[PDB]
Amino acid sequence: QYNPQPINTSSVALNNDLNTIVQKFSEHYHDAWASRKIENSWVYGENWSDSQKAHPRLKPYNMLNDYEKERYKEPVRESLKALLAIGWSVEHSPVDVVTDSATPFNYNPHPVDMTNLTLSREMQNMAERLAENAHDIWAKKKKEELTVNGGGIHPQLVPYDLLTAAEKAKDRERSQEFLKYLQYQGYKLHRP
Ligand SMILES: [Cl-]
Ligand SMILES: [Cl-]
């Protein structure tokens, strides 16, 4: 069938340096996410609405609650722990009016643009492994949720390789951008 089994991260604990890079990427990625949502005509609203394209997380990072910040930090932290777990080493060595009208918070996100940075084929492969792991983490949690509530189904409870590209996009994009951001910030990833 499908038995999601995330990477075993036993013993792996992030030190202050790697917690800091998780924090800095999370803030960067929030601004990249907000920039994309605003480009796609989303606006801030107190309650999330898919139909009305209103999103409560469309605020400056420092106005987010801890739940909101963890939407970024949790999967990023887990992807970094998974990389370490499988033996990789991590060496730290004008304002447009319609853009501004998307929120009442004078928020014009301008994250660093890493579209001109490239990833080796090896790092592209690693981003796919980390995205698959994010999917397995989600799937294991979802199966637990369904089972304790007496059963049920979910259309994305299939192996990562059976998801469509569109289904894979959120996790793939996060890991690709994280690996670019590590590169940008002067980290070197070394294979086992
Ligand atoms: Cl430390
Ligand atoms: Cl923070």
Residue numbers in the entry: 2838 to 2930, 2952 to 3050
Quote the paper.
Ryanodine receptors (RyRs) are large ion channels located in the sarcoplasmic reticulum membrane, which control the calcium release from the intracellular store. Insect RyRs have drawn a lot of attention since the market introduction of diamide insecticides used to control a broad range of destructive agricultural pests.
We also solved the crystal structure of S2946D, a phospho-mimetic mutant of DBM Repeat34 which mimics a permanent homogenous phosphorylation state, at 1.53 Å resolution. The mutation is located in the middle of the flexible phosphorylation loop and does not change the structure of the domain significantly. The first group contains seven sites clustered in the phosphorylation loop, including one in helix α0′ (S2959), four in the flexible region (S2930, S2936, S2946, S2948), and two in the structured loop region (T2973, T2976). Two sites in the phosphorylation loop (S2946 and S2948) are conserved in RyR2 Repeat34.
